[PDB]
Amino acid sequence: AAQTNAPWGLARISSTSPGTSTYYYDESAGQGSCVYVIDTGIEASHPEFEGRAQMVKTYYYSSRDGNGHGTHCAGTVGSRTYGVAKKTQLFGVKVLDDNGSGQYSTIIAGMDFVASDKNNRNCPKGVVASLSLGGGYSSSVNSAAARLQSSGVMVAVAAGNNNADARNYSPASEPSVCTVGASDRYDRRSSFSNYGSVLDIFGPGTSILSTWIGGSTRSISGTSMATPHVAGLAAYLMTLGKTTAASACRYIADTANKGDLSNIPFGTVNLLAYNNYQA
């Protein structure tokens, strides 16, 4: 399959080198795995989804998504057009306020909730979760990902805007999960990317065009956005039948484009993610 003039992210991961606008991917397309959008949830009534989206839990009053960045990244996970895993089902948790922030009680809550929910949904191919989130180191929030990870849910966590070493930040810091950094179209680590030995991968995170609340669609900037790309990709590949939840984070890392990046400070990884699709 070959969806064209594609968001550079999608195009980049389909391709061993930059300067291409076509997302190639399988027929499967991530059909039948589950992805766990842990953000400000989703506006599933957006056309792009076709009703593969649903708000499964909301630690707030209104399931309906307010901020949008939540929905946005669900779009990059698996909308029809902007999505990596175009055929996947998508499950909004709402752990965040509609002005971005939210309590660590309530993230851990929602990290613990997907460990539950995965039984209550049908995820033969396997569950993924995205945490386009984090803040200061907190051993709990890290355990709240390794606990989630130990369950057989592939967790993909963002590294952060802060241009530090990601070691300071949770749930990025965690050993077991997939920390993700962000490339720009010219294969430079974006300067808003958080780096470190901890990391295992760089997605596309600079200027990603995806869905947006109120039916619209737009382009935003963040490692936040690099996460689904890997998430939707791990959804894509657990579907193709190429890993468990616990082995994906390596197999994504093992089958990546080594030494493709510029702006890689010493210690940090030099991988960019790649769907490896012999078209």
From Swiss-Prot:
Catalytic activity: Hydrolysis of keratin, and of other proteins with subtilisin-like specificity. Hydrolyzes peptide amides
Highest taxon listed in the record's lineage: Eukaryota
Protein name, entry field: Proteinase K
Keyword Hydrolase recorded: yes
Positions of the catalytic residues: 39 (charge relay system), 69 (charge relay system), 224 (charge relay system)
Known cofactor(s): Ca(2+)
Span within the parent record: 106 to 384 of 384
EC number: 3.4.21.64
UniProt binding sites for Ca(2+) 1: 175, 177, 200
Role noted for this protein: Hydrolyzes keratin at aromatic and hydrophobic residues.
GO biological process: proteolysis
